[PDB]
Design a protein around this ligand. Structure first.
Ligand SMILES: [Mg+2]
Ligand SMILES: [Mg+2]
Ligand SMILES: [Zn+2]
Ligand SMILES: [Zn+2]
Ligand SMILES: [Zn+2]
Lengths: 151, 94, 91, 95, 133, 257, 215, 214, 192
RNA sequence: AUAUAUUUAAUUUUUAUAAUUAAUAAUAAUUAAUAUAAGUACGCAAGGAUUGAUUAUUGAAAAAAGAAAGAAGAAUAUAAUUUA
RNA sequence: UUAAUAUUUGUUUAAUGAAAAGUAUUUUAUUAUUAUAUUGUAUAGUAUUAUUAUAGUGUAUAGUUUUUUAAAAAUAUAAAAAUA
């Protein structure tokens, strides 16, 4: 993300609406997922013992200044703003997963699973029954051939 | 990312007269990671006897394509790649 | 490239760049089995160090001997006795 | 060849073993053929609104009488299975 | 055009100089790797004597009966000694016009390198690579 | 949608800007990584100095970077100077990264593993407090007489923060090319790393033999037979290294400690 | 041709992370509507942006004393003023105007309308000043105007001359600029999300859901 | 190597530690992304003379070994030089490439065992004897202590076969106990420094020291 | 002039093709491409005599007859073969024909090798090979006896190895006791 | 198979600024698919015209008034993305 | 005059004994061993320091160390897509 030099409400809304495109991202995921988090930034954060988006969001402005003007992290402000912007829905995902659960429901989850297994069993039962009918028709052909040979 | 997008089946409905065309084709390549007006998507769709390689641009109101796998399936991507390669080499007249 | 020791036949692999084209035929390298400096000869060919222009990283690729040499020391039947101690994918 | 080609050949061999275990479908007999014909005729006369019932019966008779007698026994069984599919799926969209 | 590979791969059966190594005409020890004064003729066989190829000194690669060089650089083993084809076939001793008591042969299997065992060795070794197992 | 008025990648002029139109264009390799850049006359590429081939150009670049890391500076000519400066920046970037892949890449590129080690030892601590532009390029007012090409002095910036080259004076070269470089009076008591000191001592003692004097006189004879002017006669030549000169140079080296 | 991805691009037997919530476009649109109507987290309104002519490497050592003196200037209890990250404005040779990374000037058109030019650069390193989150925008802008006036009076006194918090900020801390940033209007209301119009009742439902999640 | 990112939380390897490597605490909610886990690259361990000799000494102590209990035996060994199970696996792979040890599979228990090759068994025995003599020369004791140790050795030698086996089991379990106790007082620091050989290849030079921790 | 040579990053095969130096373990094909008066490559030393002769004699008396390609494939199928090429096999068979060991008779469209001149000596050599196989079986029985002896020797090795393990663990034990006595001798005095 | 002369195509490098005139590249006798006028006019009848629209054929053009011995990039597409 | 011309441009060495040929001031060229007078050892040719390894033995890892230049046309080679 460019941000043109400063993080704005449009960038925060961008991150918020892109949070849908990452359902498996928890508040405890690694720091390389945040935008503009290069290898230098990630190594400096690991030196600071920062392995988590929560630990990035819990940083202080003085620590961010130290990381940006004494360590060499250019987009440290952008990484920190991204973390602070996305940290609040991540806590909800971790504690309950509200936006992920209230829209589907365990009832619909189990319904989908049961219908999936029933359809998968029916697909094979169709072939089982058609093979049974084929064997029955083969036996009927054998009986008809025996009758014709007797005739 | 590419490693998690390529290989996913895509259901594409294209509004065409007199009846919209409905296809299912796996992702072969993507041109942009995040959403963008130049996003792009490369899809290989194979019908009963027809094999085609579509490049669907994003944001067209007539070309409604949806990714449904939610996952990558790199092995399925490799299988579809080999199928398309064999079909493309076969289709040339000799 | 893949090199073997002249005295014992110990084999190790290492890609050769454009700055070491003179040392592609014969390498004077320390041998771990002989525990001293031995002469190493060129055995099989690897792909390259750099990239061929407008060609992928796989082109050209190693020969069948290099691919076979790796598969005997690291693979399904090779790492199976070693997947029970550490499972290298993990620590 | 390669590892992927070897795996593909092994998968094809397994599929061919399964297909060889499975038998050729069917050569239908007169009794079940007439049963299917009666089912088709009754289903048409039950749900055949705009299509001429006479023309439908003529088409079914023509099929059962000439198409199977012209084609091979395997295709006869394929036609039998397809007629059963039509009976179960409402003549295949014949409105 | 030459129709033979270069840098023969010995991954299937490595051809290395043994620690103990005697001559065929001399039955005396030779230098192992410090000097290439010996002549190595490898063929990938453990057949006695001197498995995975016998060895000759440069000066002694000559026939043992007539003490002369070889015609086409091909010697004949005779009860543990190396003879020449005119000696083995029973013909008369022919003095060569060129060098007498030494033959044209390279050192350290350089002359016998373009022919022998290459990769792959057997057929079951290629299927080991192309199979996932 | 339609196509641009000029379709396909068409070579433009040297000073023509970008077009910013949809065009299927592929790069030869990933030039974003250090020491893997491409040479060309567009702005996205390094200025390709003259060479018989891209392979020869890469060899010249490798020897340039090797000598640059060796003696902390290099006087080059023409379009070689921007390429040398950018490649020195790339080397410093790899050294500050300090990965095993970075070590292996700098070893693949350089001609001297000892110089690879020297770079990875010195440059991190030397340019820890710098963001970019680790090398300085100065266009000299004197030109190479043979081809009238513009000369450029390329060096590294943090001279004082370095272990080697701490206090070295480049206003004038040493008395001999095998002698240690000049040192300012203020930094006379400086000390060098022992491994680099031993390497330099070995390379310098290489030239203290009589076979080198014979090579020197034979080079005089060769260049005189090849038509090169202002080359004296091997009878009039005199050795670069003698006993009394070596004694006083050893005295000065012990003074500089 | 060549495919851009080799076989070893993804290790066999390893699964990748999922890139969307569900395969259903309706559920996708509902989750997108939730995340679009969500309140803007991590968004703060600074009362004033304070800037100095020095560099961030020189101001980091004094950033805490600046916080204390700004608290004393606001006349608030100690620990109510928070300083944002230091932003070093781009050292520009041409000086395009209006850019967020452009160095500030000691003059504005509203201040000197009849002036044929502007005054030279007054700030090169800036920092936002945030109050407590419970404070309203009215109190925020009041404190901002108060600090602006006090710092302007302190700069005038310094210019006329050569214990007060403003005098300390101007002399010891080297602070030479203060501005009031305009309200950010970048976030526009999503009237429709995914083509489906967002009703007032659905917007209130999403607001209540997010309020309960924050609670 | 950290306890949370490279291994599940709660586990720890009782072995030599790397010098100046902080054992920083990783939160429990930490998880890697499926794509980020692929591109992780570990530093190469030391498969050199000291680690291979240590592993060969363990494999000579336990004749034969099994790949499961090999790490436990290495941890019980007093002078452990291995860093972790990855270092152990790399040293095993290097020994297999050099030909010191071979890997077989028992058809009874369906488990992989590590046997010593007949051609290299003599060199392994020589290495073990040299290491024993070095440990004897380095170990310090008074006259009475040396006399008591010699008497105990003579008694263990004069004991029977099964008596010697039971004595060896008791001795190795007491060695395991005293090593677990002494580890709390001192550890083994492994230090490394990369360099490049004349062939342009990058390899590390390693030092192994002992440092007291209180 | 070659594209592979002008390419900035040369491949290993491209660098091999530049190995025109007459040296040990060099590019033999690239050195053979140049004329014989330029490259010092003498004739190929092909070992002839009884060593390949008896081998091909056994392999041919087994089948009697086989074609040349079949003989070469059957030989290559084995592990130890004194023959390096089908041309070497051809030269050995030609020398054997000259010495009246094998004779080649042409069928309707091919030639096959037979043993008719030395058929009695061929059967004698076959019986000698069979007796050598019987002696190999007797040596395998002697190797089973020597393996019982080696099991006894391995029991002795296990005895000395457990003694070495005891004397080593006792040394490690006393070293750890000394260390613990240096640090906190209470535990050492408790363990005695 | 030759630039020697003529003749042409360019150029003489930010010129804040085309256009009073010289000279100068596109002056329909188009073709093919549709559909509408219309199932009209016109024919004894079967039949059945003329016809301005979309595609099809895929391009766009302005001459002379300013300070000149580097790369019109300080070059890895930023007018210095922190910099000792 | 052509001619501000064409042409040259010295930044990286993979190989080993004669004779014809060549006489270039070898100042004592070598310093010695053996034995035994005398005699002679360095550099081709194609009008040249030139597309050039004179193939008489013999075999070999000594790297057995003179090729400028910052964009263009035409030409010369080499490569040159999922079009045919
Ligand atoms: Mg001008
Ligand atoms: Mg001449
Ligand atoms: Zn070795
Ligand atoms: Zn001999
Ligand atoms: Zn002879």
């Amino acid at each position: 993300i460019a941000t043109g030099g400063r993080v704005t409400n449009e960038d925060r809304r961008w991150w918020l609406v892109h949070l849908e495109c990452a359902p498996d991202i928890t508040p405890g995921t690694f720091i390389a997922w945040l935008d503009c988090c290069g290898t230098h930034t990630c190594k400096k954060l690991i030196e600071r013992n920062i392995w988590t988006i929560e630990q990035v969001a819990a940083l202080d402005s003085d620590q961010v200044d130290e990381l940006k003007y004494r360590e060499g992290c250019l987009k440290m402000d952008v990484v920190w703003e991204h973390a602070r912007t996305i940290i609040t829905p991540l806590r909800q995902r971790e504690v309950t997963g509200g936006v992920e659960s209230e829209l589907q429901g365990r009832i619909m989850e189990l319904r989908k699973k049961r219908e999936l297994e029933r359809r998968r069993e029916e697909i094979l039962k169709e072939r089982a029954n058609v093979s049974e009918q084929r064997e029955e028709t083969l036996r009927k052909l054998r009986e008809a051939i025996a009758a014709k040979k007797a005739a | 990312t590419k490693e998690q997008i390529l290989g996913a089946p895509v259901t594409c409905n294209f509004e065409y007269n007199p009846r919209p065309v409905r296809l299912i084709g796996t992702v072969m390549d993507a041109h942009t990671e995040e959403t963008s007006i130049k996003g792009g998507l490369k899809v290989y769709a194979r019908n009963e006897e027809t094999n085609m390689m579509l490049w669907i641009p994003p944001g067209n109101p007539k070309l409604r394509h949806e990714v449904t796998s939610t996952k990558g399936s790199f092995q399925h991507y490799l299988d579809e790649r080999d199928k398309w390669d064999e079909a493309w080499i076969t289709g040339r007249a000799r | 490239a893949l090199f073997s020791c002249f005295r014992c036949g110990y084999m190790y692999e290492f890609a050769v760049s454009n700055s070491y084209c003179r040392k592609l035929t014969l390498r004077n390298d320390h041998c771990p089995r002989c525990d001293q400096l031995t002469l190493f000869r060129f055995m099989s060919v690897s792909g390259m160090v750099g990239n061929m222009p407008f060609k992928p990283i796989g082109v050209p690729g190693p020969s069948y001997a290099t691919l076979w040499w790796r598969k005997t020391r690291e693979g399904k039947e090779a790492s199976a006795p070693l997947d029970a101690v550490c499972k290298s994918d993990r620590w | 060849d390669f590892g992927r080609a070897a795996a593909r050949r092994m998968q094809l061999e397994r599929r061919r073993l399964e297909a060889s275990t499975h038998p050729p479908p069917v050569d239908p007999t007169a009794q079940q053929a007439c049963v299917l014909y009666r089912r088709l005729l009754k289903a048409g006369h039950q749900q055949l609104l705009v299509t001429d019932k006479s023309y439908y019966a003529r088409k079914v008779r023509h099929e059962f009488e000439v198409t199977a007698r012209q084609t091979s026994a395997r295709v006869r069984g394929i036609m039998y299975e397809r007629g059963q599919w039509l009976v179960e799926n409402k003549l295949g969209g014949i409105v | 055009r030459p129709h033979f590979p270069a840098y023969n791969e010995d991954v299937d059966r490595p051809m290395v100089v043994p620690p103990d190594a005697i001559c065929f005409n001399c039955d005396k020890p030779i230098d192992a790797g410090d000097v290439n004064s010996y002549v190595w003729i490898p063929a990938g066989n453990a057949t006695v004597p001197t498995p995975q190829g016998y060895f000759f000194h440069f000066g002694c690669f000559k026939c043992n009966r007539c003490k002369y060089r070889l015609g086409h650089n091909k010697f004949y083993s005779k009860d543990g000694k190396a003879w020449c084809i005119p000696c083995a076939l029973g013909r008369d001793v022919r003095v060569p016009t060129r060098r007498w008591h030494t033959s044209y042969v390279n050192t350290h299997r350089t002359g016998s390198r373009l022919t022998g065992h290459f990769f792959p060795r057997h057929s079951h070794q290629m299927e080991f690579l192309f199979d996932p197992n | 949608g339609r196509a641009p008025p000029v379709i396909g990648c068409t070579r433009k002029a040297r000073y023509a800007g970008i077009d910013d139109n949809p065009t299927i264009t592929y790069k030869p390799w990933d030039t974003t990584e250090p020491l893997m850049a491409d040479y060309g006359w567009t702005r996205g590429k390094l200025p390709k100095f003259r060479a018989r081939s891209p392979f020869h150009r890469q060899q010249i670049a490798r020897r340039m970077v090797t000598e640059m890391i060796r003696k902390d500076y290099c006087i080059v000519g023409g379009a070689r100077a921007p390429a040398l400066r950018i490649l020195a920046d790339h080397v410093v970037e790899l050294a500050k990264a300090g990965d095993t892949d970075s070590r292996q890449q700098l070893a693949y590129f350089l001609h001297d593993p000892l110089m690879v080690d020297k770079a990875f030892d010195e440059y991190p601590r030397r340019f820890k407090d710098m963001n970019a532009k680790y090398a300085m390029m100065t266009r000299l007012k004197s030109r190479r007489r043979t081809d009238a090409v513009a000369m450029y002095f390329v060096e590294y910036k943090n001279r004082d923060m370095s272990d080697n080259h701490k206090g070295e004076d480049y206003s004038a070269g040493p008395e001999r090319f095998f002698l240690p470089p000049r040192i300012v009076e203020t930094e006379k008591g400086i000390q060098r790393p022992p491994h680099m000191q031993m390497a330099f001592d070995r390379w310098a003692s290489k030239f203290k033999t009589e076979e080198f004097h014979h090579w020197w006189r034979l080079r005089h004879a060769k260049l005189r037979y090849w038509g090169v002017r202002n080359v004296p006669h091997p009878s009039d030549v005199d050795p670069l290294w003698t006993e009394k000169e070596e004694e006083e140079w050893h005295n000065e080296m012990l003074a500089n400690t | 041709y060549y495919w851009p991805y080799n076989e070893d691009f993804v290790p066999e037997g390893a699964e990748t992370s999922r890139f969307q919530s569900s395969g259903s476009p309706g559920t996708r649109r509902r989750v997108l509507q939730e995340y679009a109507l969500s309140p803007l987290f991590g968004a703060r309104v600074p009362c004033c942006v304070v800037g100095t002519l020095r560099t961030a490497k020189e101001i980091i050592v004094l950033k805490r004393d600046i916080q204390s003196l700004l608290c004393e200037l606001m006349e608030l209890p100690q620990g109510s003023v928070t300083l944002g990250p230091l932003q070093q404005l781009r050292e520009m040779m041409l000086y395009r105007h209006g850019t967020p990374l452009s160095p500030r000037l000691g003059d504005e058109r509203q201040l000197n309308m009849d002036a044929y030019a502007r005054r030279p650069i007054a700030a090169r390193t800036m920092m936002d000043v945030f109050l407590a989150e419970d404070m309203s925008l009215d109190e925020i802008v009041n404190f901002g105007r108060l600090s602006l006036g006090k710092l302007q009076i302190a700069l005038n006194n310094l210019r006329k001359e050569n214990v007060e918090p403003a005098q300390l900020l101007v002399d010891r801390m080297g602070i030479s600029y203060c501005e009031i940033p305009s309200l950010d209007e970048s976030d526009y209301v999503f009237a429709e999300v995914g083509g489906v119009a967002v009703t007032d009742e659905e917007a209130e439902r999403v607001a209540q859901r997010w309020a309960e999640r924050c609670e | 190597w950290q306890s949370g990112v490279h291994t599940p939380h709660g586990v720890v390897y009782r072995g030599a530690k790397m010098k100046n490597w902080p054992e920083q605490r990783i939160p429990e909610n930490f998880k890697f992304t499926e794509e980020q886990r692929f591109r992780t690259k570990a530093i190469p361990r030391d498969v050199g003379t000291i680690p291979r000799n240590f592993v060969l000494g363990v494999l000579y102590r336990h004749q034969p070994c099994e790949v499961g209990g090999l790490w436990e035996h290495c941890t019980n060994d007093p002078e452990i030089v291995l860093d972790s199970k990855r270092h152990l696996r790399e040293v095993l792979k290097q020994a297999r490439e050099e030909g010191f040890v071979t890997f077989e599979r028992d058809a009874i228990s369906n488990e992989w065992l590590c046997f010593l090759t007949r051609e290299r068994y003599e060199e392994v025995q020589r290495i073990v004897t040299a290491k024993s003599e070095a440990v004897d020369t380095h170990s310090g004791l008074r006259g009475a202590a040396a006399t008591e140790t010699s008497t105990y050795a003579e008694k263990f030698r004069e004991m029977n076969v099964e008596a010697k086996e039971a004595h060896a089991r008791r001795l190795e379990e007491e060695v395991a106990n005293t090593t677990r106790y002494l580890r709390r007082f001192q550890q083994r620091e492994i230090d490394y420094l990369p360099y490049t050989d004349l062939n342009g290849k990058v390899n590390f030079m390693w030092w192994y020291e002992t440092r007291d921790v209180q | 002039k070659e594209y592979r040579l002008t390419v900035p990053y040369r491949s290993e095969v491209t660098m091999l093709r530049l190995a025109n130096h007459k040296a040990i373990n060099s590019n033999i094909r690239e050195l053979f491409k140049k004329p014989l008066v330029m490259n010092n490559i003498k004739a190929i030393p092909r070992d002839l005599g009884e060593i390949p002769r008896d081998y091909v004699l056994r392999l041919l008396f087994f089948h009697q007859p086989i074609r040349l390609v079949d003989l070469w494939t059957i030989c290559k199928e084995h592990d130890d073969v004194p023959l390096d090429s089908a041309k070497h096999l051809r030269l050995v068979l030609k020398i054997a024909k000259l010495q009246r060991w094998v004779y080649a008779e042409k069928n309707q469209t091919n030639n096959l090798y037979y043993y008719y001149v030395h058929q009695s000596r061929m059967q004698e050599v076959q019986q000698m090979v069979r007796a050598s196989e019987v002696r190999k079986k007797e040596q395998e029985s002697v190797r089973e006896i020597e393996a019982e002896k080696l099991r006894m020797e391995e029991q002795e090795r296990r005895k000395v190895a457990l003694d070495e393990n005891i004397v080593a663990l006792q040394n490690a034990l006393v070293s750890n006791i000394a260390q613990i006595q240096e640090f906190d001798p209470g535990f050492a005095r408790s363990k005695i």
